[PDB]
Amino acid sequence: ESKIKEFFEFCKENEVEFVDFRFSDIKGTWNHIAYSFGALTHGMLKEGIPFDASCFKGWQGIEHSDMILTPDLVRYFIDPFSADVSVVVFCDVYDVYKNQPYEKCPRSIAKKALQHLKDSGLGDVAYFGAENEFFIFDSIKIKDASNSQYYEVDSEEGEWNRDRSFENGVNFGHRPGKQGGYMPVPPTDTMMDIRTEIVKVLNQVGLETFVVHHEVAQAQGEVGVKFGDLVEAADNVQKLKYVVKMVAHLNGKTATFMPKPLYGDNGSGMHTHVSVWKNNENLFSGETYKGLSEFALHFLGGVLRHARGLAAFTNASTNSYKRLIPGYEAPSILTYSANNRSASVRIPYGISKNSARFEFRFPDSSSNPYLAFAAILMAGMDGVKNKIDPGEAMDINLFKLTLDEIREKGIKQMPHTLRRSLEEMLADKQYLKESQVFSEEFIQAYQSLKFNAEVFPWESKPHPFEFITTYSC
Amino acid sequence: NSESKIKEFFEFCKENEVEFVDFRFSDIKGTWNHIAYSFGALTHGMLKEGIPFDASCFKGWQGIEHSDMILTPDLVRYFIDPFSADVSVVVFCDVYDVYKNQPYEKCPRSIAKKALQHLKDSGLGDVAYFGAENEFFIFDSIKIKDASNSQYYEVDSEEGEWNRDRSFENGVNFGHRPGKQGGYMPVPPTDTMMDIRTEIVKVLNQVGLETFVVHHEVAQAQGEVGVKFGDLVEAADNVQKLKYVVKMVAHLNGKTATFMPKPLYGDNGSGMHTHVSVWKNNENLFSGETYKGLSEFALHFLGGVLRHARGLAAFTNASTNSYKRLIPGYEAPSILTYSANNRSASVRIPYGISKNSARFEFRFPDSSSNPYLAFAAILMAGMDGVKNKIDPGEAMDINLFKLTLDEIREKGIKQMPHTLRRSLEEMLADKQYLKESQVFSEEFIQAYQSLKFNAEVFPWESKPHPFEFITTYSC
Amino acid sequence: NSESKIKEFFEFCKENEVEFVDFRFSDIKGTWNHIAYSFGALTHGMLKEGIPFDASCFKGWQGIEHSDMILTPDLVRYFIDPFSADVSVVVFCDVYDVYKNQPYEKCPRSIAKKALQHLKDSGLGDVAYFGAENEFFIFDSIKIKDASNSQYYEVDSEEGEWNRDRSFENGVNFGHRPGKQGGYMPVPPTDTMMDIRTEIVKVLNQVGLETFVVHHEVAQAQGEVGVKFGDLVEAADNVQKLKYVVKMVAHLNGKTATFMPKPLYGDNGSGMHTHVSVWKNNENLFSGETYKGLSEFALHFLGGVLRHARGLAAFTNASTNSYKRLIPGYEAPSILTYSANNRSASVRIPYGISKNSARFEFRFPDSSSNPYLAFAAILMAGMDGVKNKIDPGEAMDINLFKLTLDEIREKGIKQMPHTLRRSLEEMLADKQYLKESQVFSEEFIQAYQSLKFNAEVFPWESKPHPFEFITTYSC
Amino acid sequence: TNASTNSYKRLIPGYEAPSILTYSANNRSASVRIPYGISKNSARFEFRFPDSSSNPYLAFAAILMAGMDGVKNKIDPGEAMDINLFKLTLDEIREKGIKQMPHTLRRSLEEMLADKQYLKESQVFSEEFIQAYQSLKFNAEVFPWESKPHPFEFITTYSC
Ligand SMILES: Nc1ncnc2c1ncn2[C@@H]1O[C@H](COP(=O)(O)OP(=O)(O)OP(=O)(O)O)[C@@H](O)[C@H]1O
Ligand SMILES: Nc1ncnc2c1ncn2[C@@H]1O[C@H](COP(=O)(O)OP(=O)(O)O)[C@@H](O)[C@H]1O
Ligand SMILES: Nc1ncnc2c1ncn2[C@@H]1O[C@H](COP(=O)(O)OP(=O)(O)O)[C@@H](O)[C@H]1O
Ligand SMILES: Nc1ncnc2c1ncn2[C@@H]1O[C@H](COP(=O)(O)OP(=O)(O)O)[C@@H](O)[C@H]1O
Ligand SMILES: CP(=O)(O)CC[C@H](N)C(=O)O
């Protein structure tokens, strides 16, 4: 009843016309329901907002439809894009049937995960750093018929348009190749002005930014946002994606975060940077390995342990496993190395006492960031308590190594498809179930979501290529 | 190739004014290739010790540096080609290995010969008969795209649901279409292929196959011809014969044909239902009194197929598109059980069963497989059942498509594999029954798995699927 | 099937040079289905105990785990197919149940056989003669769209009044059209089908039917060919024979036909007028002096049909589109009464009545019905009337279309059901006259019921109608 | 409340719209829902079955007249069916003897002409008016719907 006080005056000052609550279902889809501002009261930011939770896969049945969304009054912001002054408020789903936060609400599973660390005493805060690579495209067509599957992404930069005629029969040239976006100047990079637009809008929504470049792939970009609390970071993951997409829309374009839209060029990742702190210290800083600690070396060993099951949350779509192909800055072998992008985890080279972190490179933004980040922690905490060796560091370009020497040398490796990684995750979920952080009911709801939403379609829908190879059998 | 077998061939050619001789052979994928000779150039020594060719052009076979191999002509089942504009005689060929000096251990017609011979040597029988129903589609068009920014296919047949509102010749649209899953088997004009189908049969007749049924099939532009059973190699030859004709009579009618298992999502798939019986001294050994007119021999055979099925499947369902077909509810099996009159099952025991018709039909193989291999492997697995009296279990006579995933997993029924990699895995974890008597060579199975992982699995896993842009582009 | 008719069938197929034997049979909808055998394959032993087939592909019949069934050939009214390019013979078949070991209780042709027999065994009569007037439309084009955001249909025909102002081949339009309701029966050029109707009649002559009238009918593109009556089963057979011929002669002339009941709003429908008489010992039992040349037997038979009509119409008007047709002002009956020379009644006593020609014309059925089931049902409805001496009321010699809304409900005439759901509920409420002598099994009345509810009513109750957007889109 | 044929294409199971005539709390599968938000002030019913093809003056009038009538005759509501009421099979519905919304406008117009007395209370709905409504809907919605062929029956029936 003070952040309420602070809130209800912050609205009077920006002339807030609508209160836009935003929540995240299990897929990570940020949803919004919005109220007329004069109808909002003190006694509804403690009562909560009713919604229908039966319209969300993995959540409520239709005979127990009504749930409460509960306002949480931090990191709210003024929508840059609405034409009538809206303010955006983060919410949790509260379960009016077990009278507790919703066991299938990710922003709660993340919250539950953030304090599990506190109550474990292993550390106080756990910081998350999310490089979210993206694409900005010109057009996006799809078809899913009985007789035809079909997609086509479009961008003027693309090698498919070197022979093409644009406005006057004209084609201004000046293109990055396949794998050529890193990092030419204009006019080759067409997207200088629009990315300084995003950042300026990201500054205005509360994220602290620091880098903006063009990425390797054809229409690819990246913004460095400053690391945050486990939850706070994923709040900012959702915020980022809203801004980028809506900046793309209003600039007459379409943007995506998906893992791998272009075959044969780089795919957007989610480079997660993690380090755990306590009593003003960075508990990964040490002297045991290249500026790292045994607590660190172990946190790592928990994530390299449950990685195959961890991909179920970290790499949550079939399209992710089109990214995990050797040869595109993306990872595959579950190992670690300093200064090395062909690894699953790179120690950043800029490593002083405060910066000491791991960069897990394997996630992409088809993960739900709350669940994704939640699960990178329980994995790590299981590393500390069970003091589990991370193995030996491999300072090799891992891609080049012949495929028979992976089985031969016995080194673990990312799963090749999603169905696989849902199966490792079900085969050992126990570290996820600590202190009912991830409940089993939710763990179940999750997979009867991802199989029905993702695995079973892929498995049953003819693939264009299957007609090159098999239609002449 | 006898010496009078040779002269009857020359005479046949002479009688028929053969201008060309067209040798044909199958590579591991199952593709049927040819190389043809001026008849005047053909001599009595070429049909005795071989035709030179370049075997490094076929994923699986030779490296560029030991590239030369030899085709050995087998003068059986040759025929005058119905479609060539100059009289030619198609002649079936084996590959000969001119380094190890022996029939090529990777030549799929050789493997089936070794298989059928393995059966004779062991004395379990003299002959394995195979019946193969090869369903096919006939389309009007097939568009494909495979670039970096796009993936795309489209079939077209005027019988198709998607054409109900379409305009054709004069803005005119004729009506009378079968529904999705409604082509079975209405009369014309809903059935727009009665003619091209009787064309097919008559030409199948010319090329040496005996026919009985022809009919329309469930899916929109789908068909089936019933051709009599041959021995293990003869049937696998007649499958290639069938596929050639159906693809050529479709082409000369300005149309295009596919034996791939699942060109349409939401409609019935195209199978190779294989019907099997093993015989010794002129008694069908499958005939008996144990279970619905079948014997303990027959049942054990069945035990081996089911036992080794998930490995077998890497040969009998030889493509990623094969698994799009193995999906509940299109008369395609998913559960590895057997039953009478039950199309929900893997193995169907048919109704009109007699001392002549004692058989099984195995409904899980498709035509994306190599017939020579998918058959040999069905035998190897099957004799492994006889030799070890492997037990099929008891028939499930339910609708298995109704069974829940929990209910299916709980009672712990074995199902088909869900992908081509898994069944390839399962097949490398279980090679022994194939390797009996050098029938399937260890070398060959390695080439086979390397070929298939590189030509089918890694494309699939690494090539974005369109429907992924529905589910994940807006994340 | 005696081995005599088997001798004469084979011998018939040698002199017409037959390459295929096209076996045919009708499902519960009435869709005529075929499956063809290479003639050289055909066997005496096969025409004795039958052809197997996949029975699970037919709504209402078997389920996939008892899918096998036997088609049993019936060597009557076979005929050379005019239309196929390679000589085929079309042969009718029944469905045999190989689980209950009996003619299939859900094969319409058997049920109709059970009806004709039941009349025999009942002693009421030796034979029941059925004459069927099968009106049709010949269109040029038919487009349909069945989507989430759209429902669409367009018929086209050059006769249609929607083309008076349109350009055809070279900016040109020949005029001379019948208007709405004008097709009866102006000479050419207005009548654009003198030659395609004569083609039909002739190809009906070839395939075995006696024809007499051929005319254009009242609606824009309509027509009717009179056929000499047959026995209950034979009349049903020739309804399938006719429908085939008419749909194929449309096809090969660049056109598309339909027996559907009401393809055009505001113009006449397509009816199937059923002419019916029952004889015994060579005398026409309908012949008498009780009313307009008919006997008591006749009237009471009629008493039966009208009593049970509301339920009967689920069997004789079998599609939601049947009920678009059953509305006043287009020569179809909505009012369940009888009258001599009145085309606005349900049943008409045609004028030229002799002792040989005493019959009733039941006018309410349409061709969307299953002819075997529709005729069986009428017979039962009428047998019930003979046995129970049901009185058909008196005659209604008026223009029944001129009867105002709350006036036909005043005088307590009952009228046809307004929707196919309502006809279905009536029939399940009055089954007992169908199951007499087990002619219509109960098991069968339930399959039919779920057949029609699922395949007609629920799609109608659930799919937005375009006209609903006129009335409610601005609500 | 559902004064159009279009109404009855919505009253179909599976689309968050009620077919079965019973009530339940937190249940979008029922005719009447009891909101969890149920204070001393906000105690209401959500009758989920109306739609905006009703004249809403007529609709709220007739809801009241029936809902009033309930009080005078102390009409018992039955037991709460707190089920996903879609999951009921057709036969389980008949055997359980469950009331259910009409499948057609024609039907509900008939069911209403057979049950009028509770609207004619204290002259609120006139016999005269009811009679004029009765014909207006019949001539303007039922008779069109029953006579204008439907696209779907050409898939179904053009090839009969
Ligand atoms: N005591 C009351 N009497 C009548 N109407 C009321 C009463 N209290 C609230 N209402 C009205 O009923 C409606 C309820 O809106 P509300 O937002 O509560 O919907 P809901 O059924 O909970 O659906 P959802 O879960 O989709 O938000 C509003 O129009 C509201 O003002
Ligand atoms: N101690 C830390 N804990 C967590 N994240 C950090 C820490 N230090 C930096 N980061 C974050 O790492 C992400 C990547 O920063 P960047 O300078 O791009 O590193 P790199 O050299 O790995 O590319 C940013 O979100 C950044 O704020
Ligand atoms: N004893 C037998 N062994 C192996 N195959 C057989 C035997 N008898 C028949 N067949 C074959 O079985 C296949 C199909 O049987 P079929 O009669 O077509 O079944 P259905 O028509 O019900 O699908 C054909 O290739 C046929 O020759
Ligand atoms: N005794 C009878 N029983 C049954 N049908 C008959 C009998 N006599 C004639 N029919 C048939 O009834 C139909 C009558 O045709 P028609 O006399 O042209 O009638 P309309 O002028 O109403 O078209 C024909 O199929 C004809 O064979
Ligand atoms: C009518 P049928 O017995 O031939 C079933 C064939 C099926 N499409 C399949 O996938 O094998």
Author numbering:
A (entry chain E): 9 to 481
B (entry chain I), C (entry chain H): 7 to 481
D (entry chain F): 322 to 481
Paper text:
The GS in H. pylori (Hpy GS) is a critical enzyme that is involved in processing the ammonia released by urease activity, and nitrogen metabolism. GS is an enzyme involved in the biosynthetic reaction producing glutamine from the condensation of glutamate and ammonia. This enzyme is present in all living organisms and is a large homo-oligomeric complex composed of eight, ten, or twelve subunits assembled into two face-to-face rings. Although the structural and sequence information of Hpy GS indicate its relationship with GS I-β due to the presence of a specific 25-amino acid residues (residues 155–179), the adenylation site (NLYDLP) found in similar homologs is replaced in Hpy GS (NLF407KLT), suggesting a lack of the adenylation regulatory mechanism in Hpy GS.
The substrate-bound form of Hpy GS (Hpy GSsub) was obtained in the presence of ATP and PPT, which is a structural analogue of glutamate. Hpy GSsub was determined at 2.9 Å and refined to crystallographic Rwork and Rfree values of 16.45% and 24.27%, respectively. In Hpy GSsub, twelve subunits in the asymmetric unit were also highly similar with r.m.s.d. values of 0.29–0.36 Å for 475 Cα atoms in residues 7–481. However, although ATP and PPT were added to Hpy GS, ATP/ADP substrates were clearly identified in all subunits, whereas PPT/P3P substrates were not identified in most of the subunits of Hpy GS. Among twelve subunits, PPT was not phosphorylated, resulting in a substrate-bound form with PPT and ATP in three subunits. In only one subunit, PPT was phosphorylated by ATP hydrolysis, resulting in an intermediate state with P3P and ADP. PPT was bound by six hydrogen bonds with Hpy GS (NP to E141 Oε1/G275 O, OTP to R331 Nε, OP to H279 Nε2/R331 NH2, and OεB to R369 NH2), and P3P was bound by seven hydrogen bonds, where the O13 atom additionally formed a hydrogen bond with R349 NH2. The possible ammonium binding site was blocked by the methyl group of P3P, acting as an inhibitor. In both the Hpy GSint and Hpy GSsub structures, one magnesium ion was identified in the n1 metal binding site. The side chain of E337 in the Hpy GSapo structure was disordered, demonstrating the flexibility of the Glu flap, whereas the side chain of E337 in the Hpy GSsub structure formed strong hydrogen bonds with the N274 Oδ1 and D60 Nδ2 of the adjacent subunit.
